[PDB]
Design an enzyme around this catalytic site. Structure first.
Site, PDB file in Angstrom:
ATOM      1  CB  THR A 187     -56.563  40.838  11.113  1.00 30.10           C
ATOM      2  OG1 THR A 187     -56.778  40.269  12.407  1.00 30.10           O
ATOM      3  CG2 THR A 187     -55.940  39.806  10.186  1.00 30.10           C
ATOM      4  CD  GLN A 188     -53.242  45.802   8.774  1.00 26.37           C
ATOM      5  OE1 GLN A 188     -53.371  46.149   7.584  1.00 26.37           O
ATOM      6  NE2 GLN A 188     -53.950  46.345   9.754  1.00 26.37           N
ATOM      7  CG  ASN A 232     -56.078  46.682  13.412  1.00 22.03           C
ATOM      8  OD1 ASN A 232     -55.725  45.636  12.842  1.00 22.03           O
ATOM      9  ND2 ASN A 232     -56.197  46.779  14.730  1.00 22.03           N
TER      10      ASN A 232
END
Ligand SMILES: [Mg+2]
Ligand SMILES: [Mg+2]
Ligand SMILES: [Mg+2]
Ligand SMILES: [Mg+2]
Ligand SMILES: [Mg+2]
Ligand SMILES: [Mg+2]
Ligand SMILES: [Mg+2]
Lengths: 238, 234, 250, 201, 213, 199, 243, 217, 233
Positions: free
Chosen positions: H1-2, H104
């Site tokens: 998740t960014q 990530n």
């Protein structure tokens, strides 16, 4: 002989000769013995020397603080398996910061050594193993064979003339669980002696001992270090 | 009769590994002895012609300043193992900045043991064992040491050891002469005395290689002269 | 698996590759083919095997191939196998032309295709190609040249040679009736019909039972052509209509 | 940092300061910027400390293998060329390396300058480091291929000192090495404090 | 966006004497203007004569620490002996360099005894550049502790002084002082100060107290 | 900053380059050579980025040599230029592009003297005379001014002499010495460096 | 990819695929080499001068670098591959290192290539032996030989191929400080050795040598008949004038 | 998740005599929107360890998925071995660090609560892999509003009872509701003791708004 | 888990023959017969589709297949192998068109497919295709007729036959017809050469025919078939 050269070939009798042949590799190796009290796991083994000017072969190896092993069969295969066993343990500590449960490690050897017995061109591992360890379920003595099969033992012995040792162990099992260390080790040394030609016995040069237990991390004893255990022997049935 | 290279015999032994142990018996003979003052290695070059440079025949080589190694058998094969060894000693020095023990080096080489096979293998994979026997002689934290290793991948330490065609005989002589307290001087003499016996040709100073490694001096390959000096006492 | 592998790339106790030798056999049964080197040209003549009264044959030739712009060749053996080695030959030519911007030196285009066949005999477990080829061409290094290649990955430059059926009777013949240093494309085409008339179970060696092609210089651009029906017979009759004239001397 | 090397009649001289900074903070002044590659080859440290040490150490490894495989010491050109090659692959990734590879070949005194930029050149004299421009000054005014051994020692040692004077990122002690046909020798190692109470004391 | 780094503070100091090595660090672990915990010493025992202290990004110190531990076990199985302080340092260098292009944001200091029995100290930068020293400090208080040691332990800037060897006793108090002074100026230093002493007899720990502010 | 010049005559080719290896504000080498020997009748004048020049130059070099050993005869200067062009242009859109500008001077015992110019982009052009570097801007006009398709090597070394003096005059980069060389039916011949009496 | 193990050990410890390769070498055109002090020589026997052939396109003699060259005996196609691989290694030893290729280095390289091919799945060994020649720039002139096994040694002189055993027995009885103590006589012993088993004609030979600094030189059939006469008759000034 | 999407705010954890307790509101925010008002941000990892997560709820569900399978796997062996609190906390640190190193991350900060061998376990884990043990834990805003209270109490009485502790958690969950704009006065309380892991349904806290009437004065 | 045989299953015998290829041809010589005629103004393909075992639905499957808008095929031998080659020819036909924007020249399509068939006589783990094809096309005015067999070799025919009695079927045509034959003419002499072996009651479902004129390739319907059958149409 059409059914003797490939582990992928079943015989008309539901057997796999290559596997059996590999088992033969174990029998050739010098005998080794394993047994546990209720607080200690003990490995005992007889080392061989090519000539008189050569040293005796290693038979006991350290895997991790709570695990050690004795080998019988191809040495190169022992090192492969030992290193796999060592790696698997290092990983457990890395990820979980706890020692790899001995029984779980054994299941991995079982899975790992099964694979090659089912694929064309591959060969069974040519080594047997006696595994002595101590986890939160107490002492343990396992056995693993060229056929991916493995066993949880009360006591055991593989190798040349190991049939005698097995017999001796089967007679004094009930005694083991309550033995104190030195007595447990003696039973081991005693059983090993069973596999020898009457005109010779245990030397501080040909005996190796491995001990792991609630009170001690796997430790190996090889030369002068073996004396303390050899003292207070037994007549040795003539 | 055609089977895989990784097939077991009913005896529980890999055919190939057994068949190469055989190949060693066709190699020249070499002897290694271990003394508290050092270790020495000797081998018969076994020259097959006057037109062949006796020097372009090295059955004894340097692995590292503190380690020498003598070979026998299909020498072409030993080339590879010898290099892996030298490279290994340097990776260890690079990483840990300290010399590698003679035992660890021998072991490193032994792991290429039964590293041969067909199916389920890479492209640059061995297809058969190395038909070689080796003797690693050197000095480290544990004093002078000699190790023997054959194709089965097995290796062990020896006070004195012989490999090659005359191995059986040579070892018999070595058992008669070794003293847990002898010296590097006595050692070298025995080596040549025995080597002289077993050789089919008359022991020349140009048909044998001798080298030592001692607690002080780093690996040394005896000169044509230094051989004359020792051979002087046939 | 080990059981069904014939080991096409292994040594025999003699120290020879049996699959190469068997490919040869197949070659010494194929349409005869040869080429001779002159000083103003070089040629190729082959035993048209696709001889039959139903084929529609729509090609410049049947066994003559244009590789380079300065090269052409002919084959003896498995045609499909040949279509493969020629296609690759054309590609090797162009790769060279792309990279250097100049026609590839004749011999070089040969050593190239040879390294490939040589490989099929050292590794891969595959059977070699059942083909032997004759190469003729011109290059600013040795002008006209004739080359021969075996499925062994072997080759050589010949002032004159033959491949295929009776590729023995053809040699020795030329091996003695060849003007080593004094050959004209005409004196060449001479031995051509002469030797083909011999090694070729055919009486009055018809125009169809043969295919001819010649390579020559010509004000810069190299020229490659295959003689037309008529142009062929001229040398057909010329041979015989001179032979009966050769027995009026004995 | 200030390093330099020049070769004359008696071989090659190599000197360097010993200061390492982290921004303006003096992190150390006991840095051995003359890397003892082999007893027959010397390297310098300029740019990134770890970058020079690591690669040259790797070079030491490669030289040793080479020697064992050819029973001959590797030539200065060959060694410097290995280093250049190893490093060129990473051009553009941030390695920071300014070094001089020195030794004595079968061609005589040898000195090569190698960059993480890709440079690799042979020369008489070279200065590398933030204080290099200063060292060049005094060294150029005083360098002669015919200098006497004890003369060459003073020059080099002086150059590095003068630099420690002007360049804020150069200082500590001044190290000096001499590369002779047999091997290299560690000439001197003097604090700058001392060297001052001499050049003017 | 997303940074894979954080600064947790904490300093580390080490001195080497004739026959002993000392490794000290505060025990505060922070982030931002907060304190994660007051009890988080940066000193860890590697062998019976080798101790390491790590400061910087705790995520990396943790991972690094576990990697070092495993590699020592490997070395032992492989050579049948434990790693000498010097080899551990040599190794740590290469481990740090493997992340040359994605560095372990970490400043390590190794404190122990060399094979000759004497005291040894090795300092490293995040990518493996290292050397041995008499004494060195890394971390936030780094520039605060050093100067006093250059003077007291190195007799620098002092004319006509007695270059007496660092008595383990005098050392132990020098350590406590610089950390107590640092605890006064570096918001990152405080809570407590754990010391690890390495000698022929083994490794002994001592925990002095610091300002909790 | 590196300068390269080449003048093609009717039977030869004269080429020259400076001998400075610059870095920051200092000349790090007094005698640097920008020329590479490919054949007995071919030279590759190479300039550009720190590693790209040598790396590429030697790469094209050893590959030309390899061609010699494999076929016995050398590559024509015309064939080498298209070779080097092929590679440079093929690396242009690769992970390892080479940032180099070059001149390929050669003599063919059949085609005569030839001078080739090449963009780091790998654009290839044949030309009577050409230059690379900032110097080119201050000297190409001179050549256009005094070059004749028949200039003799005595003339050429003089025309070069002019361009070289111009740089000592207008150019702001030191550049004291210039390696010089000629190529004719008899190969690659050196020449004295054109130097200027500056301390 | 084909992974079969082609070369394997046998019951008594033999590697047949290698011994077979060695057999193919035997069935090859003899090749001899002698190491002088100013010029090393090499000559390729049984050149089967079919005349309809073309000398150049088949000389069992080749140059690898500018300081080294070689002769071979065995499967023609294999040699090609090995030749052009050493050629490549020669130029690459100059890109990695800056100095040129050594006498031994390159030979070792070739031996390593052959050895490898006797221990890699899918491959057959190379059926050729090689006589590598060259002077150790800044040193003495050396001579080396290689066989399929991958083993290599330095020889004072030697022969490989058809009847190499004979020529070898011969060479062993003609090599002396005196015998060929000058470039003129050096190129002689080879000439004699070759002939001492070489078919009648002289048009069956293809000698050549390299100078301790000069390029390589493939002798012309002319300089051949000359040196083939300086001894054709010299084989009478002691065999037809003392016999 | 960014880019975290639906998230959960602070998480608290304090240990007491014979157990540990964790609290986390049931809110899943989407920016400033209290979007999912009834989701559990607590999980039971086997009988001796529980977990609470702050951050991206989707990632948390992911960890919950992997951890559940792991526990199941282990239970199948019934070999008398089972992950301890420290073990789960250790694995999570390796996992969070591994992902952070691939650039990530799993966008969560977590509190691991456990009890085994008469000892209390409480561990912290970042998305960057920062991990540690302590008597009290508070993530998100809780680290600025709750942790100062928790420590305050413990610096004057290190040992609390399941009741004294639950009293503190309630007090903190109130302060959080008063000051964290992304909190919800509807949480859960998980407790671990020799008896096991217990999670308590939708709870709330008495809130006092009497200062609202002090505008003028 | 599957690996793969990397050694070729076709290898030269000492006689120099490629055994598997011959045997492949044997599978061909044993297949339903096929005839092809190049009418210098078009081409015709016809074969014995004698399935219709009263239960077989002659429709559901064809032996005369369209490759492109202007190419067509028929075979003699193993049906399943054919099908594979049909999908590959059609595919090869498209890869040509996408690149050149011009329908693939019949000679070119043959060369390409022949290459494939040749591939299966050298690649490891495989046997040659047990089939022979007759490709017909109208590329650039002139009509074309080709045949490629297991070996991967091809030839252009004015007319021919393959399969059972291909020996007799050839000789028959070797005289029973010649060039200049117009459209419908070549079709008759084709269905006739077929009957020269067609054992049974050769109806409109016992055969299948396709024609290729310089205006596309197509298969004839049972109607146009039932017609030509009555010894005319
Ligand atoms: Mg801590
Ligand atoms: Mg071009
Ligand atoms: Mg490139
Ligand atoms: Mg020829
Ligand atoms: Mg010989
Ligand atoms: Mg991001
Ligand atoms: Mg059919």
């Amino acid at each position: 002989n059409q059914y003797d050269n490939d582990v992928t070939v079943w015989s008309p009798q539901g057997r796999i000769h290559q596997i059996e042949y590999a088992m033969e590799a174990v029998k050739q190796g010098s005998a080794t013995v394993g047994l546990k009290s209720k607080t200690h796991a003990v490995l005992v083994a007889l080392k061989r020397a090519q000539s008189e000017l050569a040293a005796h072969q290693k038979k006991i190896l350290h895997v991790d603080n709570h695990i050690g092993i004795s080998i019988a069969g191809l040495t190169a295969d022992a090192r492969l398996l030992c290193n796999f066993m060592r790696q698997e343990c290092l990983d457990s500590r890395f990820v979980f910061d706890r020692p790899l449960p001995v029984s779980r490690l054994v299941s991995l050897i079982g899975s790992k050594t099964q694979i090659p017995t089912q694929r064309y061109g591959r060969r069974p591992y040519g080594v047997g193993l006696l595994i002595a360890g101590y986890d939160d379920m107490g002492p343990h003595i396992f056995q693993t064979c060229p056929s991916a099969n493995y066993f949880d033992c009360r006591a055991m012995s593989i190798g040349a003339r190991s049939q005698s040792a097995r017999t001796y162990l089967e007679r004094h099992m009930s005694e083991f669980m309550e033995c104190n260390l030195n007595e447990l080790v003696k039973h081991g040394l005693r059983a090993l002696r069973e596999t020898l030609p009457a005109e010779q016995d245990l030397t501080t040069k040909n005996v190796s001992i491995g001990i792991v237990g609630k009170d001690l991390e796997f430790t190996i004893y090889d030369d002068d270090d073996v004396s303390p255990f050899l003292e207070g022997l037994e007549e040795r049935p003539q | 009769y055609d089977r895989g290279v990784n097939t077991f015999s009913p005896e529980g032994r890999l055919f190939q590994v057994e068949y190469d142990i055989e190949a060693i018996k066709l190699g020249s003979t070499a002897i290694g002895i271990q003394t508290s003052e050092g270790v020495c290695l000797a081998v018969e070059k076994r020259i097959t012609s006057p037109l062949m440079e006796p020097s372009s025949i090295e059955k004894i080589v340097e692995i590292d300043a503190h380690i020498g190694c003598a070979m026998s058998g299909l020498i072409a094969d030993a080339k590879t193992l010898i290099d892996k060894a030298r490279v290994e000693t340097q990776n260890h020095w690079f990483t840990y900045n300290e010399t590698m023990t003679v035992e660890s080096v021998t072991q490193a080489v032994s792991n290429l043991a039964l590293q041969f096979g067909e199916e389920d293998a890479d492209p640059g994979a061995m297809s058969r064992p190395f038909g070689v026997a080796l003797l690693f002689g050197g000095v480290d934290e544990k004093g002078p040491q000699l190790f023997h290793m054959d194709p089965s991948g097995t290796f062990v330490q020896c006070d004195a050891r012989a490999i090659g065609s005359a191995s059986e005989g040579a070892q018999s002589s070595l058992q008669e002469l070794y003293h847990k307290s002898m010296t590097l001087k006595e050692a070298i003499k025995s080596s040549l005395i025995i080597l002289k016996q077993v050789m089919e040709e008359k022991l020349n100073a140009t048909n044998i290689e001798l080298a030592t490694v001692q607690p002080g001096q780093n690996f040394h390959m005896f000169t044509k002269e230094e051989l004359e000096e020792v051979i002087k006492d046939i | 698996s080990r059981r069904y592998d014939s080991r096409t790339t292994i040594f025999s106790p003699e120290g020879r590759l049996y699959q190469v030798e068997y490919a040869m056999e197949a070659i010494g049964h194929a349409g005869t083919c040869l080429g001779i080197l002159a000083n103003d040209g070089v040629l190729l003549a082959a035993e048209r095997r696709n001889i039959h009264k139903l084929l529609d044959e729509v090609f410049f030739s049947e066994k003559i191939y244009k590789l380079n712009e300065d090269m052409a060749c002919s084959v003896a053996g498995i045609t499909s196998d040949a279509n493969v080695l020629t296609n690759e030959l054309r590609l090797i030519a162009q790769r060279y032309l792309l990279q250097y911007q100049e026609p590839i030196p004749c011999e070089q285009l040969v050593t190239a295709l040879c390294d490939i066949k040589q490989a099929y005999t050292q590794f891969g477990g595959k059977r070699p190609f059942g083909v032997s080829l004759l190469y003729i061409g011109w290059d600013k290094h040795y002008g006209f040249q004739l080359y021969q290649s075996d499925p062994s990955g072997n080759y050589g430059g010949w002032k004159a040679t033959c491949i295929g059926n009776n590729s023995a009777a053809a040699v020795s013949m030329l091996k003695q009736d060849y003007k080593e240093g004094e050959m004209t494309l005409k004196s060449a085409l001479a031995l051509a019909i002469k030797v083909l008339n011999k090694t070729m179970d055919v009486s009055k060696l018809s125009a169809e039972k043969v295919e001819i092609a010649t390579l020559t210089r010509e004000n810069g651009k190299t020229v490659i052509r295959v003689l037309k029906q008529k142009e062929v017979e001229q040398l057909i009759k010329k041979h015989e209509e001179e032979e009966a004239k050769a027995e009026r001397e004995k | 940092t200030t390093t330099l090397a020049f070769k004359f009649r008696h071989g090659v001289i190599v000197a360097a300061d010993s200061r390492a900074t982290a921004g303006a903070y003096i992190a150390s002044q006991t840095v051995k910027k003359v890397i003892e590659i082999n007893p027959y080859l010397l390297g310098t440290m300029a740019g990134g400390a770890a970058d020079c040490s690591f690669w040259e150490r790797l070079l030491a490894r490669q030289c040793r293998i080479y020697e064992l495989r050819n029973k001959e010491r590797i030539s200065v050109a060959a060694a410097s060329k290995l280093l250049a090659n190893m490093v060129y692959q990473y051009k553009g990734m941030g390695l920071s390396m300014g070094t001089m590879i020195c030794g004595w070949d079968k061609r005589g005194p040898g000195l090569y300058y190698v960059d993480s930029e890709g440079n690799r050149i042979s020369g008489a004299t070279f200065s590398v480091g933030s204080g290099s421009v200063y060292a060049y000054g005094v060294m150029d005014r005083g360098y002669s291929y015919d200098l006497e051994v004890e003369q060459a020692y003073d020059l080099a040692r002086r150059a590095i000192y003068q630099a420690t004077y002007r360049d804020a990122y150069s200082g500590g002690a001044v190290n000096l090495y001499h590369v002779r046909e047999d091997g290299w020798i560690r000439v001197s190692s003097d604090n700058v404090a001392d060297l001052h109470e001499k050049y003017s004391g | 966006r997303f940074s894979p780094y954080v600064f947790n503070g904490g300093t580390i100091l080490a001195i080497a004497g004739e026959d002993f090595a000392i490794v000290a660090s505060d025990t505060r672990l922070s982030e931002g203007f907060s304190i994660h915990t007051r009890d988080s010493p940066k000193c860890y025992k590697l062998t019976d004569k080798t101790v390491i202290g790590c400061s910087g990004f705790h995520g990396d110190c943790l991972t690094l620490t576990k990697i070092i531990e495993a590699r020592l076990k490997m070395y032992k199985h492989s050579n049948n002996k434990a790693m000498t302080t010097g080899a551990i340092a040599a190794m740590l260098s290469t481990i740090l360099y493997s992340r040359r292009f994605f560095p372990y944001y970490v400043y390590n200091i190794i404190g122990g005894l060399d094979e000759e029995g004497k005291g040894a100290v090795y300092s490293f930068d995040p990518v493996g550049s290292y050397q041995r020293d008499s004494f060195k400090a890394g971390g936030s208080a780094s520039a605060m502790l050093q100067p006093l040691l250059d003077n007291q332990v190195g007799f620098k800037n002092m004319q006509n002084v007695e270059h007496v060897p660092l008595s383990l006793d005098r050392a132990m108090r020098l350590v406590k002082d610089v950390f107590i002074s640092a605890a006064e100026r570096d918001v990152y230093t405080g809570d407590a100060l754990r010391i690890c002493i390495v000698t022929k007899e083994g490794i002994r720990e001592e925990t002095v107290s610091l300002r909790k502010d | 900053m590196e300068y390269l010049i080449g003048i093609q005559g009717p039977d030869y080719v004269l080429v020259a380059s400076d001998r400075v290896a610059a870095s920051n504000i200092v000349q790090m080498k007094d005698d640097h050579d920008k020329m590479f020997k490919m054949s007995e009748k071919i030279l590759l004048l190479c300039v550009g980025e720190a590693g790209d020049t040598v790396q590429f130059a030697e790469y094209i070099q050893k590959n030309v040599q390899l061609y010699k050993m494999r076929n016995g005869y050398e590559l024509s200067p015309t064939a080498a230029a298209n070779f080097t062009r092929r590679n440079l242009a093929d690396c242009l859109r690769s992970r390892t592009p080479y940032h180099v500008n070059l001149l390929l001077a050669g003599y063919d015992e059949h085609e005569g003297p030839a001078l080739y110019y090449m963009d780091y982009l790998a654009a290839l052009a044949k030309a009577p005379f050409a230059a690379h570097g900032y110097g080119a801007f201050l000297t190409l006009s001179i050549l256009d001014r005094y070059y004749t398709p028949t200039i003799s090597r005595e003339r050429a070394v003089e025309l070069l002499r002019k361009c070289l003096e111009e740089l000592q005059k207008r150019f702001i980069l030191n550049l004291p010495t210039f390696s010089v060389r000629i190529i004719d039916k008899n190969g690659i011949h050196d020449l004295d460096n054109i130097s200027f009496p500056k301390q | 990819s084909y992974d079969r193990a082609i070369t394997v050990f046998s019951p008594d410890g033999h590697l047949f695929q290698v011994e077979y390769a060695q057999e193919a070498v035997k069935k090859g055109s003899t090749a001899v080499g002698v190491r002088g002090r100013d010029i090393v020589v090499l000559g390729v026997e049984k050149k089967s001068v079919a005349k309809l052939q073309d000398e150049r396109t088949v000389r069992k003699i080749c140059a690898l670098d500018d300081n080294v060259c070689m002769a071979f005996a065995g499967l023609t196609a294999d040699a090609r591959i090995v030749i052009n691989r050493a050629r490549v290694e020669c130029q690459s030893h100059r890109l990695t290192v800056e100095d040129p290729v050594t006498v031994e280095y390159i030979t070792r390289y070739i031996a390593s290539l052959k050895q490898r091919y006797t221990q890699s799945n899918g491959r057959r060994p190379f059926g050729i032996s090689a006589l590598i020649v060259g002077f150790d720039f800044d040193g003495t002139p050396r001579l080396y030989q290689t066989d399929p096994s991958g083993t290599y040694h330095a020889w004072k002189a030697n022969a490989i191929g058809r009847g190499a055993k004979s020529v070898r027995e011969f060479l062993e009885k003609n090599y002396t400080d005196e015998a060929i103590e000058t470039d003129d006589l050096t190129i002689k012993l080879v000439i004699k050795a070759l002939l001492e088993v070489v078919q009648s004609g002289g048009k069956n030979i293809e000698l050549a040598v390299m100078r301790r600094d000069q390029s390589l030189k493939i002798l012309n059939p002319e300089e051949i008949e000359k040196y083939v006469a300086e001894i054709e008759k010299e084989k009478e000034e002691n065999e037809k004038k003392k016999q | 998740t960014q880019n975290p999407m639906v998230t959960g705010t602070s998480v608290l954890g304090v240990k007491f005599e014979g157990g540990v307790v964790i609290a986390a509101d049931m809110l899943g925010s989407y920016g400033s929107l209290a979007r999912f008002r009834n989701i559990s941000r607590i999980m039971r990892v086997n009988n001796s360890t529980m977990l609470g997560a702050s951050g991206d709820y989707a990632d948390f569900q992911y960890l919950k998925q992997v951890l559940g399978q792991m526990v199941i796997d282990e239970e199948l062996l019934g070999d008398g071995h089972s992950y301890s609190p420290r073990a789960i906390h250790s694995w999570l640190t390796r996992a969070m660090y591994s992902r952070r190193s691939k650039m990530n991350p799993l966008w969560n900060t977590m509190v691991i609560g456990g009890y085994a061998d008469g000892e209390s376990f409480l561990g912290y884990v970042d998305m960057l892999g920062v991990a540690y043990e302590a008597p009290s834990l508070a993530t998100g805003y809780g680290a600025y509003l709750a942790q100062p209270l928790l420590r305050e109490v413990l610096e004057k009485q290190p040992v609390l009872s399941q009741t004294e502790a639950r009293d503190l958690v309630e007090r903190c969950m109130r302060v959080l509701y008063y000051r964290d704009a992304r909190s919800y006065n509807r949480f859960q309380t998980a407790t671990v003791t020799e008896k096991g892991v217990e999670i308590e349904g939708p709870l709330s806290t008495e809130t006092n708004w009497d200062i609202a009437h002090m505008i003028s004065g | 888990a599957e690996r793969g045989y990397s050694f070729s299953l076709t290898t030269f015998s000492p006689s120099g023959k490629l055994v598997q290829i011959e045997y492949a041809l044997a599978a061909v010589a044993g297949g339903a017969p096929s005839v092809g005629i190049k009418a210098a103004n078009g081409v015709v393909l016809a074969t014995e589709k004698k399935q219709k075992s009263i239960l077989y639905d002659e429709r559901s499957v064809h032996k005369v297949e369209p490759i492109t808008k202007h190419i067509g095929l028929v075979y003699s031998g193993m049906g399943p192998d054919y099908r594979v080659l049909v999908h590959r020819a059609r595919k090869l036909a498209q890869q040509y068109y996408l690149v050149y924007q011009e329908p693939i020249p019949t000679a070119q399509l043959v060369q390409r497919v022949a290459s494939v068939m040749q591939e299966y006589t050298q690649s490891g783990g495989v046997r040659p295709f047990g089939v022979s094809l007759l490709i017909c096309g109208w590329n650039e005015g002139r009509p074309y007729l080709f045949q490629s067999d297991p070996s991967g070799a091809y030839f252009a025919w004015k007319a021919t036959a393959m399969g059972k009695n291909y020996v007799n079927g050839k000789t028959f045509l070797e005289k029973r017809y010649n060039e200049d034959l117009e459209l419908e003419d070549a079709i008759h002499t084709a269905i006739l050469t077929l009957k020269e072996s067609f054992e049974g009651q050769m109806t409109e479902d016992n055969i299948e025919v396709g024609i290729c004129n310089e205006a596309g390739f197509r298969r004839l319907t049972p109607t146009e078939v039932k017609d030509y059958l009555a010894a005319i149409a």
